[PDB]
Design a protein around this ligand. Structure first.
Ligand code: ADP
Ligand code: 250
Ligand code: GLC
Length: 477
């Protein structure tokens, strides 16, 4: 069984969110579970420089211009790179220019990603051809459409990591992407009078997967599907929609082995976590104090994540005696609101605006609680990292957060299953009840520790996820 993943990012070479983490760990896990998994990425500069043994496989002309298909290895996995300097050799984000504007040739940049995933099924590589083409998110959304246009020489799965990003392009671009004009239909890739790369992946894929069991159900609702629900409801009924939870990459996210930490520690030696906390307090400019709970955020700053609610609730949090440490970048309203909060409460609120990979480990390894108050959350990896690091997650019951965190209620405590704090509604009062829950658990240090050790007993394994993907791939054949 040979599978090609088609995607736009991969940790540690290029990452803007959780997707990169998945693509960096899932394939190696699949190989260990008996599937021959390879990855296809655009040759963005950080990607191209990371794959140092890449060799030429072929050259082709394309509706988007010429490509050199390269193949090398990263961390023992086979990586194909689409080297097309005129599309992909640009600094910064893979998705937008330095002024945060989507590149105007994005339609071609990402149509080509999908076209190459499909062509791989037709022998683009003389020495290897996938049985299944596994496309991830809108960027890779056209891979199943090109496959359909060609008579489906391989099967396809489409995984939605996030249904809010739809890859909308004007309809006239049907002229530019070499697909049958007849694909521009409601039963096809048309969505609200435009081309949608997400609609295309959802429509043409043999099977659709979401990145948690509950998100898979949620996207059959208008509230989470934003117009795709009728399509997703139909695929559910046909048995062509399922949820497979993400794992965590233990080589990177384990406090037991984490070289990025002041002090490593385990489920049975959590006293060794305290130094991380002390150093994090110093680093953020917070008061150095082990008697006080340290709440943290590590997160993209968009409305998805419900962080305006954190701002609203912050005075309540401070009033009860907690600190906040935030790392994140995105919406300038959020950036400026949190900077202002940091300026307003020196020693209580510490804030760093930007993307900082190493610093996120130091937060995760030093904080007491991780706040993930999402409006929607396909999976959420930060809360999985908190569990593993014994930093109790405080989450809204939605998406993968609903699948992974167990509230500190009476039954869950008694059953020894409690691992974090959960609130229901997207408003600051509801968030604030869970925060108070946290302060109450905090005043009972031996209950807090009991909850920490259960959080750290939870396991989210990529080789277990791969078993599920593998069953799917074989069912498809
Ligand atoms: N500002 C940041 N600095 C460093 N890492 C970040 C930052 N923001 C998000 N991350 C990381 O990006 C990944 C986010 O994954 P996830 O929780 O699934 O949410 P999303 O994919 O929606 O961003 C995690 O590894 C998280 O630690
Ligand atoms: O905004 S764009 O649609 O132009 C580009 C991406 O959709 C932005 N992303 C990166 C991939 N994502 C999933 C990463 O976990 C979040 C949305
Ligand atoms: O699948 C990895 C990540 O993808 C998406 O970007 C989601 O926003 C996030 O919840 C998920 O964990």
């Amino acid at each position: 069984m040979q599978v090609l993943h088609v995607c736009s990012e991969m940790f540690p070479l290029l990452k803007t969110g959780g997707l990169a983490d998945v693509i960096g760990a899932l394939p190696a896990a699949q190989i260990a579970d008996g599937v021959d998994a390879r990855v296809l990425l655009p040759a963005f500069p950080d990607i191209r420089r990371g794959v140092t043994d890449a060799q030429v496989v072929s050259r082709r002309d394309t509706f988007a211009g010429h490509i050199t298909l390269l193949f090398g290895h990263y961390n023992g996995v086979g990586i194909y790179l689409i080297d097309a300097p005129h599309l992909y050799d640009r600094p910064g984000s893979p998705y937008h220019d330095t002024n945060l504007f989507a590149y105007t040739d994005n339609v071609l940049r990402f149509a080509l990603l999908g076209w190459v995933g499909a062509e791989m099924a037709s022998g683009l590589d003389p020495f290897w051809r996938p049985d299944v083409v596994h496309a991830h998110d809108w960027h890779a959304g056209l891979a199943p459409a090109y496959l359909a246009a060609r008579g489906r020489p391989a099967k396809s799965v489409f995984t939605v990591h996030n249904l809010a990003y739809q890859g909308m392009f004007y309809a006239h671009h049907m002229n530019d992407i070499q697909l049958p004009w007849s694909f521009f239909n409601i039963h096809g890739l048309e969505f609200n009078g435009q081309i949608s790369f997400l609609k295309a992946g959802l429509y043409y894929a043999d099977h659709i997967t979401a990145v948690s069991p509950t998100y898979a159900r949620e996207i059959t609702e208008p509230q989470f599907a934003y117009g795709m629900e009728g399509l997703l409801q139909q695929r559910h009924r046909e048995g062509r929609l399922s949820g497979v939870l993400n794992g965590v990459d233990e080589k990177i996210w384990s406090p037991e082995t984490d070289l990025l930490l002041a002090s490593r520690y385990t489920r049975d030696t959590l006293e060794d976590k305290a130094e991380n906390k002390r150093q994090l307090q110093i680093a953020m400019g917070l008061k150095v104090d082990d008697k006080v709970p340290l709440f943290a955020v590590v997160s993209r700053l968009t409305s998805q994540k419900g962080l305006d609610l954190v701002l609203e609730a912050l005075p309540g949090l401070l009033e009860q005696g907690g600190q906040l440490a935030l790392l994140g970048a995105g919406d300038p309203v959020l950036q400026e609101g949190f900077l202002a909060a940091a300026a307003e409460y020196p020693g209580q609120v510490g804030v760093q605006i930007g993307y900082h990979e190493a610093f996120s480990h130091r937060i995760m390894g030093g904080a007491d609680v991780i706040l993930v108050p999402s409006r929607f959350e396909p999976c959420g990896l930060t809360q999985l990292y908190g569990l593993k690091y014994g930093t109790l997650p405080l989450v809204r019951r939605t998406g993968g957060l609903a699948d992974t965190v167990s509230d500190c209620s009476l039954e869950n405590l008694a059953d020894g299953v409690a691992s974090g704090f959960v609130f229901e509604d997207s408003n600051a009062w509801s968030l604030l009840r869970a925060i108070r829950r946290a302060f109450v658990l905090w005043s009972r240090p031996s209950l807090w520790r009991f909850v920490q050790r259960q959080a750290m007993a939870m396991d989210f394994s990529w080789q277990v996820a791969a078993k599920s993907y593998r069953e799917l791939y074989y069912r498809l054949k």
